[PDB]
Design an enzyme around this catalytic site. Structure first.
Site, PDB file in Angstrom:
ATOM      1  N   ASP B   6      58.339 -23.660  -1.318  1.00  0.00           N
ATOM      2  CA  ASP B   6      58.892 -22.361  -1.657  1.00  0.00           C
ATOM      3  C   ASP B   6      57.889 -21.292  -1.104  1.00  0.00           C
ATOM      4  O   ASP B   6      56.734 -21.193  -1.551  1.00  0.00           O
ATOM      5  CB  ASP B   6      58.923 -22.336  -3.157  1.00  0.00           C
ATOM      6  CG  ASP B   6      59.549 -21.082  -3.756  1.00  0.00           C
ATOM      7  OD1 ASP B   6      60.189 -20.296  -3.100  1.00  0.00           O
ATOM      8  OD2 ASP B   6      59.431 -20.921  -4.954  1.00  0.00           O
ATOM      9  N   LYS B  67      57.412 -11.228   3.300  1.00  0.00           N
ATOM     10  CA  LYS B  67      58.719 -11.856   3.357  1.00  0.00           C
ATOM     11  C   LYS B  67      59.831 -10.764   3.334  1.00  0.00           C
ATOM     12  O   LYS B  67      61.000 -11.054   3.534  1.00  0.00           O
ATOM     13  CB  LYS B  67      58.873 -12.827   2.183  1.00  0.00           C
ATOM     14  CG  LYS B  67      60.236 -13.529   2.141  1.00  0.00           C
ATOM     15  CD  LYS B  67      60.299 -14.348   0.926  1.00  0.00           C
ATOM     16  CE  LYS B  67      61.453 -15.279   0.938  1.00  0.00           C
ATOM     17  NZ  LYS B  67      61.256 -16.162  -0.234  1.00  0.00           N
ATOM     18  N   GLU B 171      67.026 -21.079  -0.859  1.00  0.00           N
ATOM     19  CA  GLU B 171      66.441 -21.223  -2.225  1.00  0.00           C
ATOM     20  C   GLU B 171      67.368 -21.782  -3.369  1.00  0.00           C
ATOM     21  O   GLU B 171      66.976 -22.736  -4.040  1.00  0.00           O
ATOM     22  CB  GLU B 171      65.697 -19.948  -2.615  1.00  0.00           C
ATOM     23  CG  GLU B 171      64.488 -19.697  -1.745  1.00  0.00           C
ATOM     24  CD  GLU B 171      64.070 -18.252  -1.701  1.00  0.00           C
ATOM     25  OE1 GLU B 171      64.642 -17.438  -2.494  1.00  0.00           O
ATOM     26  OE2 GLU B 171      63.130 -17.926  -0.933  1.00  0.00           O
ATOM     27  N   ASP B 195      68.559 -15.860 -10.195  1.00  0.00           N
ATOM     28  CA  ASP B 195      67.205 -15.902  -9.786  1.00  0.00           C
ATOM     29  C   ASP B 195      66.616 -14.581 -10.166  1.00  0.00           C
ATOM     30  O   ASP B 195      66.837 -13.560  -9.475  1.00  0.00           O
ATOM     31  CB  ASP B 195      67.124 -16.165  -8.269  1.00  0.00           C
ATOM     32  CG  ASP B 195      65.731 -16.455  -7.790  1.00  0.00           C
ATOM     33  OD1 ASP B 195      64.754 -15.926  -8.370  1.00  0.00           O
ATOM     34  OD2 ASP B 195      65.598 -17.209  -6.805  1.00  0.00           O
TER      35      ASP B 195
END
Ligand SMILES: Nc1ncnc2c1nc(NCc1ccc(Cl)c(Cl)c1)n2[C@@H]1O[C@H](CO)[C@@H](O)[C@H]1O
Ligand SMILES: [Cl-]
Lengths: 111, 377
Positions: B6, B67, B171, B195
């Site tokens: 991850d 990111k 993810e 999430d």
């Protein structure tokens, strides 16, 4: 009525008091080098670079003190843990006085 | 050995499926996640925890949130709107962003995947320290909403770091795989992945039939996370200091930081018991701040924020043309999903439907990516 559990807390606080002593020594070292570097040795551009290196290290000292505070601020001491509560607070105010020392330095050099 | 990684906006995690079981690897400092931070100094490069610890002493040459820049062009709405809030410098190299820093005195510049390769070298090194083998095969996860350039930019980052990127897996697909959702039988199943992390909120709908995944829809709120809930407590206790001592603490950085740290911690305590105590000695002008907050008070402070987590849910269902009644599985990932009220809201949306939450939600994406790297390996 001294209890076994308060010894646990007094031990954490003693461990935290010895870290505090490390950073206070760093702070002494900084002030010593400050004194020597402001004492003329270098061309003024080069002093500036030296003073900015110290500034960054005073910043780390400030930071290290804050991290100790943050960990002190995780303790929950019953009112009857009078010895611990006194030690916790002595230590907070120690750090805080040390923090004033840092600001005093940081406030003058490298802007 | 093959690891699952991850590669998070704020933190990264590395798993390895070994002995019939996934082991989430602890870094050199003993933590199961590693901040996705890289710091440049006069003397060396720091990655992870070492780079985060020293962000106050060097915020300028400490890079994070790469990111949010990876695979994007420079005038992406997103690069533009986060540049506003980053102490490090984003330059424009003919329309591609590069982070510029000071490193051993020489001004250096780096594409986001060079910065992301740094973190992938970290995570790879991390796993090799635990295993005492060389590690080269990995699955790396991305968000479902990632585009081709963003998917390729990440794959590159891995390749620059010495890894063999077996695949790029989304993810929620990773999270779903963690809960053996791909193992269920027969009829097609819709899966909502919820999430909620420290800073972002991603909703995904996926379909799974016969272990075959498709992304149905993608929603979220790019700036709603646990940080917003911590601020609601900070505001609460600043107003309380003001009521008891008639002192305004809020221009004291160090008092607010102390408070905010106790807030965040008390918040976590509140996911597992119904009241949190705080003692901060000498908070402001020498005055002790001893207080306490109940779970209902914390819940009430955040009432609009908790329930508003449902508008990306409804909106992801709109986009997927699904009735809320046709989601067969709900999965929770990201640390803020421990908050009971939120787990409750969500269940009470899905007319009291159960939830997959037994795998540490900070760990679930790397878990699934581990399980899949072993299969691909
Ligand atoms: N039990 C909990 N209840 C409510 N929120 C929790 C939470 N746990 C976390 N995150 C993970 C976490 C575990 C342990 C530690 Cl020491 C930390 Cl700093 C974070 N969070 C939040 O998840 C985000 C990512 O860390 C953060 O907002 C964190 O506060
Ligand atoms: Cl974490």
């Amino acid at each position: 009525g001294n209890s076994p559990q308060e010894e646990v807390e007094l031990k954490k606080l003693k461990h935290l008091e010895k870290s505090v002593e490390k950073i206070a020594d760093q702070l002494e070292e900084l002030n010593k080098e400050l004194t020597g570097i402001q004492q003329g040795f270098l061309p003024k551009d080069l002093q500036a670079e030296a003073l900015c290196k110290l500034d960054r290290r005073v910043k780390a000292t400030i930071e290290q003190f804050m991290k100790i505070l943050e960990e002190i601020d995780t303790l929950i001491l019953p009112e009857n843990f009078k010895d611990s509560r006194l030690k916790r607070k002595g230590l907070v105010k120690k750090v805080q006085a040390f923090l004033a020392e840092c600001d005093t330095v940081e406030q003058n050099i490298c802007q | 050995p093959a690891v699952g990684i991850d590669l998070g906006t704020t933190y990264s995690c590395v798993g390895v499926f070994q002995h019939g079981k996934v082991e989430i690897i602890a870094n050199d400092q003993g933590n199961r996640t590693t901040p996705s931070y890289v710091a440049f100094t006069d003397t060396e490069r720091l990655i992870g925890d070492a780079a985060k610890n020293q962000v106050a002493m060097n915020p300028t040459n400490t890079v994070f949130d790469a990111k949010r820049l990876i695979g994007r062009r420079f005038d992406d709405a997103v690069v533009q709107s986060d540049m506003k809030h980053w102490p490090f410098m984003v330059v424009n190299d003919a329309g591609r962003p590069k982070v510029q820093v000071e490193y051993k005195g020489e001004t250096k510049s780096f594409y986001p995947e060079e910065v992301s390769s740094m973190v992938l070298t970290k995570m790879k090194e991390i796993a090799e320290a635990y295993l005492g083998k060389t590690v080269t095969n990995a699955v790396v996860t991305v968000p479902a909403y990632f585009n081709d350039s963003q998917r390729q930019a990440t794959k590159d980052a891995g390749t620059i770091a010495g890894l063999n990127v077996l695949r790029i897996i989304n993810e929620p697909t990773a999270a779903a795989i963690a809960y053996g959702l791909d193992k269920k039988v027969g009829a097609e199943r819709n899966v909502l992945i919820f999430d909620l992390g420290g800073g972002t909120f991603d909703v995904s709908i996926l379909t799974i039939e016969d272990g075959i995944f498709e992304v149905k829809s993608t929603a979220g709120d790019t700036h709603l996370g646990g940080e917003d809930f911590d601020n609601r407590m900070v505001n609460h206790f600043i107003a309380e200091f003001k009521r008891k001592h008639k002192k305004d603490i809020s221009e004291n950085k160090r008092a607010v930081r102390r408070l905010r740290t106790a807030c965040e911690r008390a918040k976590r305590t509140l996911s597992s018991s119904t009241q949190a105590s705080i003692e901060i000695d000498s908070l402001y002008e020498g005055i002790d701040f001893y207080t306490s907050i109940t779970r209902a008070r914390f819940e009430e402070l955040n009432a609009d924020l908790f329930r508003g987590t449902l508008d990306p849910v409804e909106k992801a269902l709109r986009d997927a043309k699904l009735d809320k009644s046709q989601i067969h599985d709900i999965v929770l990932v990201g640390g803020s999903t421990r908050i009971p009220k939120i787990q409750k809201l969500l269940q009470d949306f899905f007319n009291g439907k159960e939830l997959n939450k037994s795998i540490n939600p900070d760990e679930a994406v790397a878990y699934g990516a581990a399980v899949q790297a072993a299969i691909l390996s």
